[PDB]
């Protein structure tokens, strides 16, 4: 009827070349361990779909993190298990240690490796220029790996990026909303947190790919090198794009919807209005002048784009001038 189909630019056909058992998570057989091996210590965080507790493994005396999944759907539980197993061992991806359940409650829990929690309230005022360049390269290692395995995170945000500043360790957690990329498939546009949603989700463009994660990665970079959290602050989904239109311009947005034949809903035409494309230098002030550079503003500009095909891929992002300072040493 209308919309033009889109493809991923890298790792397009890695899932169609791999066997059935890999991408089909409904056919995955869960291998349950022993829930008496783990004994709860403290509660660390709450979730919509989960409850997080720090626990102690009583068999080897080791510390473990338990994610008790609140009752959702048997598919979504299988989906997070399968994805976690596939990505296991990969650089900066959370290692799933064990899966256990309670035979009375029937509610399942996920046992992770114990990652040391440093809280955003402390790291924020500590965060230096080299720090950002180091850790941003670590998220990219995690993203380039899961994109290479044929998986998109779909929820990249500072809450799902654990940082251990004392040992300079980074992990990309929370794979509840991750999904396998099949070329040409339409997906749900209600995935990420509102502040980290890409233009394709807001305009109902259902045929997205790995590049969605890259947009979210930008909204994180823009949050740190400008010290404004979040960067695109919208109180609803319609408002969020207006916020994006006030920075990147309305002209490139209309060029985006015309290229793919995406038709906006009635209530969008006036409130979108018209805004020009304002430079990234506008948001810079003294609090973040030491975190910003010509390498940083160029890297952000190739990340935060309306067209998903035009954004930097995870591999092209790593090879940017912004990371020459950190790449090896």
């Amino acid at each position: 009827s209308g919309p033009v189909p889109s493809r991923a630019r890298v790792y397009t056909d890695v899932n169609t070349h791999r066997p059935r058992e890999y991408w089909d998570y409904e056919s995955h057989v869960v291998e349950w361990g022993n829930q008496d091996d783990y004994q709860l210590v403290r509660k660390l965080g709450r979730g919509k779909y989960s409850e997080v507790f720090e626990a102690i493994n009583i068999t080897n005396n080791e510390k473990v993190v338990v994610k008790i999944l609140k009752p959702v759907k048997k598919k979504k539980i299988k989906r997070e298990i399968k994805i976690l197993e596939n990505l296991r061992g990969g650089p900066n991806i959370i290692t799933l240690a064990d899966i256990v359940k309670d035979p009375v409650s029937r509610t399942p829990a996920l046992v992770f490796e114990h990652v040391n929690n440093t809280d955003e309230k402390q790291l924020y005022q500590t965060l230096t220029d080299y720090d950002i360049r180091f850790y941003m390269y670590e998220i990219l290692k995690a993203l380039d790996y899961c994109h290479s395995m044929g998986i998109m995170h779909r929820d990249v945000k500072p809450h799902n990026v654990m940082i251990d500043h004392e040992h300079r360790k980074l992990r990309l957690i929370d794979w509840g909303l991750a999904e396998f990329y099949h070329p040409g498939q339409e997906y749900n546009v209600r995935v990420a947190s509102r502040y980290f949603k890409g233009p394709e989700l807001l305009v109902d463009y259902q045929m997205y790919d790995y590049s969605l994660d890259m947009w979210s990665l930008g909204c994180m970079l823009a949050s740190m090198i400008f010290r404004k959290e979040p960067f695109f602050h919208g109180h609803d989904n319609y408002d969020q794009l207006v916020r994006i239109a006030k920075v990147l311009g309305t002209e490139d947005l209309y060029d985006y919807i015309d290229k793919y034949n995406i038709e906006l809903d009635p209530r969008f035409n006036d409130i979108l209005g018209r805004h020009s494309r304002k430079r990234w230098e506008r948001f810079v002030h003294s609090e973040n002048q030491h975190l910003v550079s010509p390498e940083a503003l160029d890297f952000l500009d190739k990340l935060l784009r309306y067209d998903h095909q035009s954004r930097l891929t995870a591999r092209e992002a790593m090879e940017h001038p912004y990371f020459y300072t950190v790449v090896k040493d």
Binding site: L40, R42, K43, R46, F53, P71, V72, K73, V104, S105
Partner: protein, 195 residues
Amino acid sequence: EVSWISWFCGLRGNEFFCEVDEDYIQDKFNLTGLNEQVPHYRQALDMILDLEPPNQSDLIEQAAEMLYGLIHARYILTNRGIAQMLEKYQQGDFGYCPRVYCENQPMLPIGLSDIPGEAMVKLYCPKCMDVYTPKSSRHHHTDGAYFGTGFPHMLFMVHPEYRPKRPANQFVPRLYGFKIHPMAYQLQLQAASNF
């Protein structure tokens, strides 16, 4: 015209119950899995949310009484349910510990089993950390499953500041000023076995 939720919690014997927010119940997601535990799930949910509808009316009412209780035990684990129960706990709506050397510590409700019909509601004291049967006979017909097996342990995990310090003094048994040799119960416990 008074809502069903406040009517049910208002009843005698149901002093342990807190009023579950309507929007928690209206949020379809929170009640996942409960549609296979209770009979007449459709009519029961309407009868809790005060929406429009033979001894059928009696059976739906029992189902809604069961339905609310299984929502309640899910609700009191959340930060909104905890804050509501914390309010009741701070006024001593649940009762006070029977052990002398706890000094009337306020208690929290706990079920020994999560499966309905296995045990009635019991009381948990955070000071001695043991479980007790409610003194009043009005609470002798409320199901323990409508409170959960891990409500108290979750409340102290969310609010750890509420944990009391251990009993200052112990019960020291004395006959004519003499303590009793624990060798002496070992000796008493046989004479009853040997018997």
